Design an enzyme around this catalytic site. Structure first.
Site, PDB file in Angstrom:
ATOM      1  N   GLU A   5      16.114  14.524 128.090  1.00 37.23           N
ATOM      2  CA  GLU A   5      15.221  14.198 129.195  1.00 37.23           C
ATOM      3  C   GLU A   5      13.760  14.487 128.869  1.00 37.23           C
ATOM      4  OE1 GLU A   5      15.108  16.499 133.245  1.00 37.23           O
ATOM      5  OE2 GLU A   5      16.280  14.682 133.473  1.00 37.23           O
TER       6      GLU A   5
ATOM      7  N   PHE B  48      29.070   8.152 129.178  1.00 41.58           N
ATOM      8  CA  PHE B  48      29.746   9.082 128.288  1.00 41.58           C
ATOM      9  C   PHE B  48      30.628  10.016 129.095  1.00 41.58           C
ATOM     10  CE2 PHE B  48      27.686   8.309 124.121  1.00 41.58           C
ATOM     11  CZ  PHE B  48      26.740   7.396 124.534  1.00 41.58           C
TER      12      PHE B  48
ATOM     13  N   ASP C 170      24.454   8.873 133.557  1.00 38.45           N
ATOM     14  CA  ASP C 170      25.370   9.997 133.594  1.00 38.45           C
ATOM     15  C   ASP C 170      26.642   9.622 134.360  1.00 38.45           C
ATOM     16  OD1 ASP C 170      23.314  11.498 132.322  1.00 38.45           O
ATOM     17  OD2 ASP C 170      23.389  13.063 133.860  1.00 38.45           O
TER      18      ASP C 170
HETATM   19  O1  LIG Z   1      30.797  18.245 128.421  1.00 36.57           O
HETATM   20  C1  LIG Z   1      30.091  17.257 128.676  1.00 36.57           C
HETATM   21  C2  LIG Z   1      28.754  17.410 129.010  1.00 36.57           C
HETATM   22  C3  LIG Z   1      27.989  16.272 129.273  1.00 36.57           C
HETATM   23  N1  LIG Z   1      28.567  14.988 129.209  1.00 36.57           N
HETATM   24  C4  LIG Z   1      27.825  13.755 129.477  1.00 36.57           C
HETATM   25  O2  LIG Z   1      26.425  14.036 129.510  1.00 36.57           O
HETATM   26  C5  LIG Z   1      25.910  13.748 130.844  1.00 36.57           C
HETATM   27  C6  LIG Z   1      24.790  14.745 131.147  1.00 36.57           C
HETATM   28  O3  LIG Z   1      25.324  16.064 131.388  1.00 36.57           O
HETATM   29  P1  LIG Z   1      25.377  16.658 132.810  1.00 36.57           P
HETATM   30  O4  LIG Z   1      26.252  17.872 132.781  1.00 36.57           O
HETATM   31  O5  LIG Z   1      25.641  15.544 133.810  1.00 36.57           O
HETATM   32  O6  LIG Z   1      23.863  17.192 132.949  1.00 36.57           O
HETATM   33  P2  LIG Z   1      22.995  17.418 134.252  1.00 36.57           P
HETATM   34  O7  LIG Z   1      22.541  18.832 134.295  1.00 36.57           O
HETATM   35  O8  LIG Z   1      23.705  16.878 135.444  1.00 36.57           O
HETATM   36  O9  LIG Z   1      21.861  16.554 133.993  1.00 36.57           O
HETATM   37  C7  LIG Z   1      20.690  16.997 133.270  1.00 36.57           C
HETATM   38  O10 LIG Z   1      20.963  16.960 131.904  1.00 36.57           O
HETATM   39  C8  LIG Z   1      21.355  15.602 131.454  1.00 36.57           C
HETATM   40  C9  LIG Z   1      21.673  15.785 130.002  1.00 36.57           C
HETATM   41  O11 LIG Z   1      20.555  16.367 129.299  1.00 36.57           O
HETATM   42  C10 LIG Z   1      20.321  14.526 131.808  1.00 36.57           C
HETATM   43  O12 LIG Z   1      20.852  13.180 131.675  1.00 36.57           O
HETATM   44  C11 LIG Z   1      19.915  14.637 133.276  1.00 36.57           C
HETATM   45  O13 LIG Z   1      18.777  13.836 133.537  1.00 36.57           O
HETATM   46  C12 LIG Z   1      19.523  16.091 133.618  1.00 36.57           C
HETATM   47  O14 LIG Z   1      19.240  16.186 135.024  1.00 36.57           O
HETATM   48  C13 LIG Z   1      27.157  13.840 131.732  1.00 36.57           C
HETATM   49  O15 LIG Z   1      26.999  13.151 132.978  1.00 36.57           O
HETATM   50  C14 LIG Z   1      28.168  13.161 130.850  1.00 36.57           C
HETATM   51  O16 LIG Z   1      28.007  11.742 130.866  1.00 36.57           O
HETATM   52  C15 LIG Z   1      29.899  14.840 128.863  1.00 36.57           C
HETATM   53  O17 LIG Z   1      30.394  13.713 128.825  1.00 36.57           O
HETATM   54  N2  LIG Z   1      30.657  15.985 128.614  1.00 36.57           N
HETATM   55 MN   LIG Z   2      24.598  14.734 135.576  1.00 33.66          MN
END
Ligand SMILES: O=c1ccn([C@@H]2O[C@H](COP(=O)(O)OP(=O)(O)O[C@H]3O[C@H](CO)[C@@H](O)[C@H](O)[C@H]3O)[C@@H](O)[C@H]2O)c(=O)[nH]1
Ligand SMILES: [Mn+2]
Ligand SMILES: O=c1ccn([C@@H]2O[C@H](COP(=O)(O)OP(=O)(O)O[C@H]3O[C@H](CO)[C@@H](O)[C@H](O)[C@H]3O)[C@@H](O)[C@H]2O)c(=O)[nH]1
Ligand SMILES: CCCCCCCCO[C@@H]1O[C@H](CO)[C@H](O)C[C@H]1O[C@@H]1O[C@@H](C)[C@@H](O)[C@@H](O)[C@@H]1O
Ligand SMILES: CCCCCCCCO[C@@H]1O[C@H](CO)[C@H](O)C[C@H]1O[C@@H]1O[C@@H](C)[C@@H](O)[C@@H](O)[C@@H]1O
Ligand SMILES: [Mn+2]
Lengths: 279, 279
Positions: free
Chosen positions: B236, B60, B144
């Site tokens: 998660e 995504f 992600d």
């Molecule tokens: O504005 C945004 C925000 C999120 N994402 C998608 O959602 C994923 C997750 O968001 P991210 O900002 O990467 O979250 P993290 O804090 O890096 O990851 C935490 O939060 C994620 C979403 O809950 C979980 O997949 C992970 O395990 C957890 O460590 C991103 O990689 C994208 O693929 C978007 O495309 N646009």
């Molecule tokens: Mn991430």
């Protein structure tokens, strides 16, 4: 469809603490090798009971080997898949010599008569009993009769296809394995091939995978017969060829097939589960 | 039906020599934990190529996160399932911002537009794309986007259901895990339960098992929303609840989800395969 496990309280697995450091617990194709200390039987029992798993056990007792049935079956009742549905299939030329063994609830025994006679067992399991097994059990376990259960043998073994490490060869290098070495046999394995030496006395899997294995071995044995060659260790040679080319999804340690008279009780074995009886 | 492997020459696995003595390589429910040194990739590649395996990868990239796609995809081309059939599914609110990335043969990319907006990903994977995935791929890998591949990520991960050990918690005791702890949430796990803390950033399995997981998590998240509660770590938290009650059939080590800026390069990691990019 698999329903949710209930809440359970058990020790946390710790990533930086191996269960066993003295033995290989996973094959290079990512199949578990089943040793004591590698499994929580409570979790596995839950998983398999939630699927109402039925395990078939095949055993042949032809001619004098009917004498081994009483101890085999009585000890199976103490140790084999206790709490699960079990269907024993006893193949014999002497139905009247089958001992009357008292079974726990959810367990049944069928006596299958065969004609007085390697080829028979693979043939019977594949050709004659194919439809029966598919209708009646989820997994098939195929063992020798000249054996006794001494400790737990349970659902930790169940998987689409398994073989068991031969107790005499688990520490051997592949060139020493007693595979069939003549290129004229269907069971031929050259000296630079082979993962393990599996014993013909204990194999199993899903009904579909066991029927595939036994059909393939029976066909290969018929080819050899037509070509005037008999593999050095008969069905076991063919089983080894099959499991080289079709990797098992679990491998049982020699806990599951041991001869204490011959080999004692080495440090690497925490349990002796299924053992040779004098013959 | 699985055809025979060809003859292969590779090192013999030795029963009395573990691959890794420093880490747990199998869970108590007999699922492999995938670390470097536990698998022969040549054997696994053969097994999966003989089945003409197709792997779908979902990612995504919504709002500003479209910026991460170029490195994500270009590095996936270098390291993800090379030699196998791959179908990327890029979900975005800005189809025109998807970079034009050159793909190897047997690999394809589909751009799926979603509305401008946790709940979305589980919902999209389960509800909207169910039929698509069942028709097009054998396995689904859900990751992600704010990540890059640095080393091999291949068919060793494939299995009916997998999760990945969170890099911050693989050495933690279960009471320290950041599970949802309020009994009012569907994601609730008490302090005496839990095997591992899995990261939401990398999970997968067969299409059927991934659709089961994502449907269950989406339904649980809707229940929480109706009850006025949001789990502490969103999707998660629900993923962790699901994998507690439905044990994964493989677990990926933190080689498969690492943050080097945060956590360095510890001795236990022989490879850093898929790593966080600054955001
Ligand atoms: O504005 C945004 C925000 C999120 N994402 C998608 O959602 C994923 C997750 O968001 P991210 O900002 O990467 O979250 P993290 O804090 O890096 O990851 C935490 O939060 C994620 C979403 O809950 C979980 O997949 C992970 O395990 C957890 O460590 C991103 O990689 C994208 O693929 C978007 O495309 N646009
Ligand atoms: Mn991430
Ligand atoms: O007269 C016989 C001879 C054999 N059997 C059956 O066949 C099995 C195998 O024969 P056995 O005498 O037990 O052979 P072993 O030498 O103990 O075992 C070797 O030979 C077997 C048959 O080839 C393989 O299963 C084993 O792996 C291999 O170690 C027996 O347990 C019985 O179930 C009979 O029922 N009656
Ligand atoms: C005294 C007999 C020594 C047998 C040692 C090796 O075991 C034999 O290995 C053969 C393959 O090389 C084949 O599997 C038969 C097997 O012998 C059987 O199993 C042994 C463990 C003993 O129980 C033996 O009595 C039995 O015949
Ligand atoms: C500086 C941030 C410290 C984050 C450490 C713990 O990681 C976080 O763990 C949460 C669950 O307790 C949840 O999974 C988010 C996760 O943070 C993500 O992953 C880390 C490994 C970092 O890449 C971080 O930047 C990212 O937000
Ligand atoms: Mn025997």
């Amino acid at each position: 469809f698999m329903v949710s496990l209930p809440r359970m309280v058990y020790p946390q697995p710790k990533v930086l603490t191996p269960c066993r450091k003295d033995v290989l617990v996973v094959t290079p194709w990512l199949a578990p090798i089943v040793w004591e200390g590698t499994f929580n039987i409570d979790i596995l029992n839950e998983q398999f009971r939630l699927q109402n798993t039925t395990i078939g056990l095949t055993v042949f007792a032809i001619k004098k080997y009917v004498a081994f049935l009483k101890l085999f079956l009585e000890t199976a009742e103490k140790h084999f898949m206790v709490g699960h549905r079990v269907h024993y299939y006893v193949f014999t030329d002497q139905p009247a010599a089958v001992p009357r063994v008292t079974l726990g609830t959810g367990r049944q025994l069928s006596v299958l008569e065969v004609g007085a006679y390697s080829m028979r067992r693979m043939e019977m399991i594949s050709d004659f009993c194919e439809r029966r097994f598919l209708s009646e059990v989820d997994y098939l376990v195929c063992v020798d009769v000249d054996m006794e259960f001494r400790d737990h043998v349970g659902v930790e073994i169940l998987t689409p296809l398994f073989g068991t490490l031969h107790p005499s060869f688990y520490g051997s290098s592949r060139e020493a394995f007693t595979y069939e070495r003549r290129p004229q046999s269907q069971a031929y394995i050259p000296k630079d091939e082979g993962d393990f030496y599996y014993m013909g006395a204990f194999f199993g899997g899903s009904v579909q995978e066991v029927q595939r294995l036994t059909r393939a071995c029976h066909q290969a044995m018929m080819v050899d017969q037509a070509n005037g060659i008999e593999a050095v260790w008969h069905d076991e040679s063919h089983l080894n060829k099959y499991l080289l080319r079709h990797k098992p999804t679990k491998v049982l340690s020699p806990e599951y097939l041991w001869d204490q008279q011959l080999l004692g009780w080495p440090a690497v074995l925490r349990k002796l589960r299924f053992t040779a009886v004098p013959k």
